[PDB]
Structure 1
Amino acid sequence: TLHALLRDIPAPDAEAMARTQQHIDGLLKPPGSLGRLETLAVQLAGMPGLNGTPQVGEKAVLVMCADHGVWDEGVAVSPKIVTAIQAANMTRGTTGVCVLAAQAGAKVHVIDVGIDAEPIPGVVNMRVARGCGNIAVGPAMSRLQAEALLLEVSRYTCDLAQRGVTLFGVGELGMANTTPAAAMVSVFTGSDAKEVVGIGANLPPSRIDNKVDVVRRAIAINQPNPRDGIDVLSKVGGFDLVGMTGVMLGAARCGLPVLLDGFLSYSAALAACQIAPAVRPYLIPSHFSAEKGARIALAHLSMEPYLHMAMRLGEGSGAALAMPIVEAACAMFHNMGELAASNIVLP
């Protein structure tokens, strides 16, 4: 059951974290001089799946692909078919996340949770339906469908842990998905749609007004409950967004770290933390999306991204780009010399 899953998410190991902090303080450098790299190492040390120490074994980026019915409301400029096309390209390694993941030594897992097209060979099949319902006139899916996908994705995720994966990255693919993402952010943060609706994948500025209106309509018609993350996801979210939330719950249950990506991932993280606050300690920010509603989303998650690249591609491209940073924290921890060894004393 999902209740068991949520109930079994482990709390951070404070004992391992204390030993980490002490060790970092004794390294060949002025105490605290490596700033957020030190904080990151301690965070990792508290994750039970890492065996009491900051370490990175195998790396995987999970890309959840699906189509959205709200695409018919004219909120996206790319043809709907671009989702299926790009999902296929993911298997050929020519996409942005594939190239960056290869650069970071990570494997890309492409999962189809609801693409509106024939099944794509090479893509993991977990499709709920051929595209989710149009949120502007009703819910994206039933609560049952949402919970089922959460469970399936979380199981898939923690199963990879048995294959040596210790670091996850989340990603997505789905034309028009920045619309339900904005709706969710508006609902969870209590912000007006206008403040969190962006241009997504180059939406013309003249078409923004319509996008804001669609978001408002979706909310008014569905009346999602902000205190129920599953309610929000099933009503104004999408299969892809649900899948991303599932990776976060899965990794957390597995006691492992997850790298967030951009705007879509922020909306999924808001939902995950609402569903289970215990997931928070396992989330690691990557970059600061150029999407309008990024600042608001990040503020509610109390997260400060490490990378400011004005990126807005999605796919988990930002998550892959940050993996080297996580490895750097581990390298610092394990490979630096110690002050005592050089007889140096620094207050």
Structure 2
Amino acid sequence: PEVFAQARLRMDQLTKPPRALGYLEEVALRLAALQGRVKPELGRGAVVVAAADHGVVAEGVSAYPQEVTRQMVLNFLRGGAAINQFALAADCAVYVLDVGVVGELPDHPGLLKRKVRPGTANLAQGPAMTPEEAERALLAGREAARRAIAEGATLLAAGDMGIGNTTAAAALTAALLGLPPEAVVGRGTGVGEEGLRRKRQAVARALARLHPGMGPLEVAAEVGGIELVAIAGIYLEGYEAGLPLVLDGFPVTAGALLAWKMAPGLRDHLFAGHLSREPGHRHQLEALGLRPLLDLDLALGEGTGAVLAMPLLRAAARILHMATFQEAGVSRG
């Protein structure tokens, strides 16, 4: 691992005071170690937005009708969503993966139709999905990332779209980290005390069907969402492909937690794009041991926070491309 050492040695000789580029110096080094290069290279990015509906909307956990998921997917394909706008500004390709949206979707170049089932079952009253479906969701996730990678992605983010997925995310997070509902439940798409109560209860109901020994994917099948599992697959594929992986918000990071529990060293490839407003996000980042690159009080999802951070990751990658004191003829003191 001479590269880790060499990159670190070069960093110390770049033309700038020691520690002058703060947290970006650490990012630069991680990117260096990931690619096995002293001077990391980054270009075209990609985000795979996984969409699926949740049966838990029946418990009244969202402020939006279930139909918003399907409608937003069409919005993604037509470029009218936030993720479309940010991806345009960040040189990021946009892929949309349907793994569980309720309703049919027409064929479209930017859409991978892999519907595992019309939304999950109500997670508050039983397993969200079966083990076989969870495996298909994971497979669909890996497939989409694979395509994004084959098409030139150098940085990979995952995005989410699923009305009521903050509940599934909280349950999956509480389960994988051994946390109580109160620690992982938040505002979501904008809910008051009545909503929060109903979410905490749904999470509690799910956690009560779990037991020690259950593997991470079995836990995800019981308490999560189809798109959350697909997201875990997106990161698993990217990790195996050795690419830098960028985290978005609470629902997306919940999927990253699953991937991590299934692949221990995957955290080495993760970069937290931001810290969302969702209270549970802090817990996820603390367990992943990651510092958010951005904190803009975002609460949208879709992979927006991850995509907004891509430019920063590219800037960090360029740090080691700077001249050293000797290379630039600059006195060091």
- Equivalent of residue 33 in structure 2, options 25, 36, 46: 46
Aligned partners of 1:262 and 1:314 also within 8 Å: yes
Q: TM-score, normalised by structure 2?
A: 0.94
- Equivalent of residue 94 in structure 2, options 73, 83, 108: 108
The verdict on how the C-alpha distance between 1:270 and 1:324 changes in structure 2, with shifts beyond 3 A counting, is: same
User: Is residue 81 from structure 1 mapped to residue 67 from structure 2 by the alignment?
Assistant: yes
3-state SS of the aligned residue for 1:165?
coil
Aligned partners of 1:188 and 1:226 also within 8 Å: no
- Provide the residue aligned with 2:107 in structure 1: 121
3-state SS of the aligned residue for 1:63?
strand
The offset of 1:164, in angstroms, is 1.7
User: Is residue 179 from structure 1 mapped to residue 182 from structure 2 by the alignment?
Assistant: no
Q: TM-score, normalised by structure 1?
A: 0.91
- Provide the residue aligned with 2:49 in structure 1: 63
Which stretch of the first structure deviates more once superposed, 147-156 or 85-94? Answer: 147-156
User: Is residue 252 from structure 1 mapped to residue 239 from structure 2 by the alignment?
Assistant: yes
- Equivalent of residue 78 in structure 2, options 58, 68, 92: 92
Which letter does structure 1 place at the counterpart of 2:254?
A: S
- Provide the residue aligned with 2:153 in structure 1: 165
Which letter does structure 1 place at the counterpart of 2:40?
A: P
User: Is residue 194 from structure 1 mapped to residue 182 from structure 2 by the alignment?
Assistant: yes
The offset of 1:64, in angstroms, is 0.1
- Provide the residue aligned with 1:6 in structure 2: none
The verdict on how the C-alpha distance between 1:226 and 1:82 changes in structure 2, with shifts beyond 3 A counting, is: farther
The verdict on how the C-alpha distance between 1:227 and 1:329 changes in structure 2, with shifts beyond 3 A counting, is: farther
Segments of 5+ residues of structure 2 without an aligned counterpart are: none
Which letter does structure 2 place at the counterpart of 1:218?
A: A
Counterpart-to-counterpart distance in 2, 1:34 and 1:227: 44
User: Is residue 25 from structure 1 mapped to residue 48 from structure 2 by the alignment?
Assistant: no
- Equivalent of residue 143 in structure 1, options 122, 131, 134: 131
The verdict on how the C-alpha distance between 1:342 and 1:51 changes in structure 2, with shifts beyond 3 A counting, is: closer
- Provide the residue aligned with 2:313 in structure 1: 326
The offset of 1:226, in angstroms, is 7.2
- Structural RMSD (CA): 1.7
The verdict on how the C-alpha distance between 1:51 and 1:126 changes in structure 2, with shifts beyond 3 A counting, is: farther
Aligned partners of 2:95 and 2:148 also within 8 Å: no
Aligned partners of 1:16 and 1:53 also within 8 Å: no
3-state SS of the aligned residue for 1:46?
helix
- Equivalent of residue 240 in structure 1, options 208, 227, 249: 227
Which letter does structure 1 place at the counterpart of 2:284?
A: A
- Provide the residue aligned with 1:5 in structure 2: none
Which letter does structure 1 place at the counterpart of 2:150?
A: Q
The verdict on how the C-alpha distance between 1:289 and 1:81 changes in structure 2, with shifts beyond 3 A counting, is: same
- Equivalent of residue 313 in structure 1, options 290, 300, 314: 300
Cα distance per residue 1:252-292 (max 9 Å; x no partner): 00000110001112211211111111211111101101012
Q: Give the number of equivalent residue pairs.
A: 330
- Provide the residue aligned with 1:11 in structure 2: none
Counterpart-to-counterpart distance in 2, 1:101 and 1:224: 41
Which letter does structure 1 place at the counterpart of 2:221?
A: S
3-state SS of the aligned residue for 2:279?
coil
The verdict on how the C-alpha distance between 1:167 and 1:225 changes in structure 2, with shifts beyond 3 A counting, is: farther
3-state SS of the aligned residue for 1:139?
coil
User: Is residue 339 from structure 1 mapped to residue 325 from structure 2 by the alignment?
Assistant: yes
Segments of 5+ residues of structure 1 without an aligned counterpart are: 1-13
The verdict on how the C-alpha distance between 1:40 and 1:186 changes in structure 2, with shifts beyond 3 A counting, is: same
- Equivalent of residue 279 in structure 1, options 258, 262, 266: 266
Aligned partners of 1:88 and 1:120 also within 8 Å: no
Aligned partners of 2:158 and 2:246 also within 8 Å: yes
User: Is residue 156 from structure 1 mapped to residue 144 from structure 2 by the alignment?
Assistant: yes
Which stretch of the first structure deviates more once superposed, 142-151 or 299-308? Answer: 142-151
Aligned partners of 2:48 and 2:144 also within 8 Å: no
